[PDB]
A paper describes a structure:
By searching the environmental metagenomic sequences with the conserved Ruvc nuclease domain of CasΦ2 (Cas12j-2) proteins, we identified a new hypercompact type V CRISPR-Cas system derived from Caudoviricetes, named Cas12j-SF05 (or CasΦ-SF05), which phylogenetically belongs to the Cas12j family. The CRISPR locus contains the Cas12j-SF05 gene encoding a 737 aa protein, and a CRISPR array that consists of 36 bp repeating sequences separated by 35–38 bp spacer sequences. The results showed that Cas12j-SF05crRNA has a preference for a 5′-TBN-3′ PAM (B is for T, C, or G) for target dsDNA cleavage.
To investigate the molecular mechanisms of Cas12j-SF05 crRNA recognition and cleavage of its dsDNA target, we reconstructed the dsDNA-bound Cas12j-SF05crRNA complex by incubating the Cas12j-SF05crRNA with a target dsDNA containing a ‘TTC’ PAM for 30 min. The complex was presumed to be in a post-cleavage state, as the target dsDNA would have been cleaved by the Cas12j-SF05crRNA during the incubation period. The Nuc lobe contains a C-terminal RuvC endonuclease domain (RuvC) and an invisible zinc finger domain (ZR), which is responsible for cleaving the target dsDNA. We could not observe the density of the PI domain, but we did observe that the bases of A-3 and A-2 of the TS, which are complementary to the 5′-TTC-3′ PAM, are recognized by two highly conserved glutamine residues Q202 in the OBD domain and Q127 in the RecI domain. Upon PAM recognition, the residue S336 in OBD domain facilitates the unwinding of target dsDNA by binding to the backbone phosphate group of G-1 (right inset). The subsequently formed crRNA-TS duplex is further stabilized by a series of sequence-nonspecific interactions mediated by a long α helix and an adjacent loop region in RecI domain (right inset).
Author numbering: 54 to 465, 537 to 598, 626 to 649
Amino acid sequence: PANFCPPAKVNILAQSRPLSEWPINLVSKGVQEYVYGLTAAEREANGDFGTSRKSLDRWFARTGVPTHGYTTVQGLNLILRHTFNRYDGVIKKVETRNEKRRSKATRINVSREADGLPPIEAEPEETAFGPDGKLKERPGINPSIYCYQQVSPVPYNPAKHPALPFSGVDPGAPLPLGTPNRLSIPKGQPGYVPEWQRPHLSTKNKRIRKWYARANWRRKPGRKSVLDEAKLKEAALKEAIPIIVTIGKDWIVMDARGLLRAVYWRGIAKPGLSLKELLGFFSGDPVLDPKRGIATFTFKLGAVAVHSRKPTRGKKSKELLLSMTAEKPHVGLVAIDLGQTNPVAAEFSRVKREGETLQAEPLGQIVLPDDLVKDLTRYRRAWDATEEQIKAEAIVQLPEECRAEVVKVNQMPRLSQETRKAVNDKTWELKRASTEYVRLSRRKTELARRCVNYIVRETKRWTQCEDIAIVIEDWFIQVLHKAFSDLALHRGLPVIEA
RNA sequence: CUUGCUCGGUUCGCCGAGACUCCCCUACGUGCUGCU
DNA sequence: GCAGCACGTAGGGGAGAATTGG
DNA sequence: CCAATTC
């Protein structure tokens, strides 16, 4: 039973007015501001919002949060239930911490009592509420508009929707395509392929990029072109696929080509499908991001065919392998010991079902290709280059009393175990706001996933088995282990540890 | 495989290769050693 | 258990749709 | 046609 719904993001093309000014956003912000300030006793009093119209009306009347004109039951149930669950979230954190601590105390003290030692004094368990009645760690306001059934996206129709300069496709008509006859574009026209790179054109299933894509015109050291943005923007808008969400009086228009590519690269749909089916492949409750301009869709329960299991280990591993050998009698394991030198070392095997025990059959080993290692080396160069800059910038912004001590640390004694905390905090703050650091941190994840995908692809070729299993042991060590453990969560492939 | 993102080559006319589980929010923690 | 190192980690909350009633 | 109930 498939139970995983990966996201798919689309771009906002136009708005009636900025998303932060909508009544839904205002009522969400007001509710979030009000609820978090409630004390421990006040939550029980103001915890009867109810899933009905009368209950919601009396909740808004009893308190003083302005409804801001937004009075929709489907949508206020999402705002209130999420907001009160965040209030219980901070309580649940300290509750589970104290539960683990009390289990430790119960084990240790009962063991000592069995040994005759009296139990130690009970520790002052932490409370989530501050001095008078307020939460110490007050939850922050969550900026997001959670769409619902009554405002589900629909294909654009100029008749019943506000007029915008770009056109709108027919919901029932088959969706358009790129340019198949790419080699037939005459010289001097957009998309023209010169007569020197025609032979070494890819034959594989590459994703087709249109000539106005930003990837073909962005600024890199080798690109001696011009990045005129207006021309690319209008050329891209001329061929958009608009879908619209109307919440009350406001509306928003999205570009649906993101959904098209999401269903295309996953292979769930083939070229030649309508917009109605394309929207039917996704949930009718997207999420709007006011800060970026991205609406995030998630696939329906059934669109993807993965199970999203857990990395079982220990005793359950043998039973998992036995059950899988009860399925098609060819299981190809791979061992991912992150050994010396190369970041990845693999060792394929095959096991049968010999009654009760397994019969492993070795099949050899493989190392990472040289191009991938070159890419990893270049990434590490870039990461170290940005690290040597951000650390220096953090050191510069330290207070003079701490700055002198840190300078002495650089100079050549190792002391001052009170400014290490300040250095750590300043470094975390700088890292959280450095855009280049975010880009290089996403690059690490992308490269790690590239390595895992390569290993999975090669482990299906050597063993010639469709179903595979992964064995791991507990720089790139942590990131690669995380990327390999995500396969159970994301793609459903079992991930055994040791 | 039409948008968006990342890395490269160029004759600058665009084509070679990738990831696709993502968001907010609050805390200062996590592993590796040296001695008790 | 209690210091020195590097490096980000940990843990709360999210991410619908059939029906049906005026 | 569109909110409101329900699980």
